[PDB]
Subunit: 185 residues, 4 copies
Amino acid sequence: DGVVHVLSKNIDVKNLQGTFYEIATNASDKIFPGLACRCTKYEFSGLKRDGNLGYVLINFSCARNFIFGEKKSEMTFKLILNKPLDENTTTVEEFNASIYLVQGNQQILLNGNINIIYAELNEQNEFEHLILGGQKSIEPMIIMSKYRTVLLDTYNKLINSLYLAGYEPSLLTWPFIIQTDQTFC
Amino acid sequence: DGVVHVLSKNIDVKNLQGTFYEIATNASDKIFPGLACRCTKYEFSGLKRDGNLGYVLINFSCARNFIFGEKKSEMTFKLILNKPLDENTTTVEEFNASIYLVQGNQQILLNGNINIIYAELNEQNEFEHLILGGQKSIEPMIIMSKYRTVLLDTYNKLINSLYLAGYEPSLLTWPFIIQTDQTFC
Amino acid sequence: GVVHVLSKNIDVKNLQGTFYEIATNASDKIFPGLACRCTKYEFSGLKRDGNLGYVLINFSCARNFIFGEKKSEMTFKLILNKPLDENTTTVEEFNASIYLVQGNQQILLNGNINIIYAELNEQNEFEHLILGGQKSIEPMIIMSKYRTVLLDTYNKLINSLYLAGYEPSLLTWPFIIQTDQTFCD
Amino acid sequence: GVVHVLSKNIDVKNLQGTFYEIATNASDKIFPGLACRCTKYEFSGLKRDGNLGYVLINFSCARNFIFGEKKSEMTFKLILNKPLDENTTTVEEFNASIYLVQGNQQILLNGNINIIYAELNEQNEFEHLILGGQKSIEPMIIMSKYRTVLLDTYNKLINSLYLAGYEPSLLTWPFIIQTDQTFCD
Ligand code: NA
Ligand code: NA
Ligand code: NA
């Protein structure tokens, strides 16, 4: 049972919009865009439609550190929902999508199964915290927040959220969970 | 002068065919595909014209290690030479090319200036060793070879090639140059 | 690249108790800090052998061996480099040699470790300690009365390093490492 | 997880002069081998304190501080754990304690280090040593008379680790680190 289930069902894809800050990731996420990033940032667009496709664009931006200086690094992704989405509703029982790399009209599938695992709604019915993950503990997982920092309490909840989702309790500390440096930026 | 120069001119693209093994890379090669890679390999397709335009396909494979085990990892790349190439000739003054990530009928540009900096021919007019790289020491650079491993004399020679080419001398040692593990493949 | 003390006229008496390691530079990982989580320092408070003053330090952490954690404990001695009359318990500048110690043996590690910056509170006890060398590249440690600190407090501590003469570009992720102070049962 | 010595009846007389470090597991880095290139152990050959067999080691490396390399130089003392008769020069197993030393001071670091494997050359000397604890995750070091070794030699040495009781999975990159022996004065 190293297999992780979604906690947060019934997600209004409409309020998957605006800026989130990478708080922390597992190792498997550094493999593509994360490596050597500081001040990592996801500007999710809003929900968009091409016929029966629900999808959100993501602008990824970081200060990538090349030791003898930092270059800004920008890339667009496209989260496409795997199941088609009826135009009467904006809500899905589970957010389960294919993340593509996007440049002009060309697109390349990176992962066929990315999930919102956990979402905290705040007073104004919006996303304060998001955990994105695959169906397995070793597949790329990202903790992002409406804010650059979260108090130790928040962080232990988000980590406990990963547990109840079914991450090995052993993979919830330093070597396997890496804090993104959000300091200057 | 700041810039990495091509040493190996008048290159017969016809013979950029077959497997080469990753010996060593700079840190910046890891930001994209090589992050946790053992046993890394590049199969070239040899020259392909689609008219006045010359290009080569690379199948990248590695045993990427997730700490709890290794999956295989397979991607395709497309080197499109920047100058056009006449149909009579199979040769170019310098190998200068844009590199694309490809998948099905999709291509995403990653870099407008990747070069063959140095190549070692044999009597049978074919590539023993290759160094690919950009114009600065901070763009990805790869040393690869006909052979899974190489004697120190050969490695000392390839690193020197990089010195002569204009690659900053203090960036030719460990933290900045990473030997690829080619044990057990 | 010379760093100077900010905090002068420091009362050594009240350098006792438990400080948690918040952040180190890469240099400090060379000796006892590599792969440490939950890193803690217990100070003895001022001890004298006549005009010679010193302080003892119980270093402890949970070292991560990727497949589990050993508790690792060591003792260090800070000997003040200048003598210290049996009148006062205050020094113009805390400047000391640090020793590894085990029973009555003691091996010198560094002849210049300083208290760069110290924050006192109403009861004249230390909220935060920055320990450092004379060069930015020598080992540097940020430790607190508290296991975690607010982005605010951390920014104040980094500002202090700046004014002490750490290169502003040495004060971000690759060269300043946050210690994992979570799940420390 | 339990390792047994393979090379028995070792002549400690001919544990002398200069070995170059080929490779290491993660655990050796924790003390001195961090950021070390060109790592080198000069053994003193067997010394006697009557009943006590012991060997000195001048450890030296080029330590990489990112912005330049200092020489790093330490002395160790290997005391054999069972007393050694002055008639014999040869132990059934080399099981010894390693101390850091500096002038007349010594501090125990590990009380159970073993020569697991010695390869004898025609002068009946050590071509190759493997040092190591009883446990796969204790510090292990593969060191050779030569700065490099042939893939065949490397595979033979890694094979010895398997026969001695290392998990097959801990014999590849993340856990076995090759030492950079490039650019070494
Ligand atoms: Na590698
Ligand atoms: Na002993
Ligand atoms: Na190394």
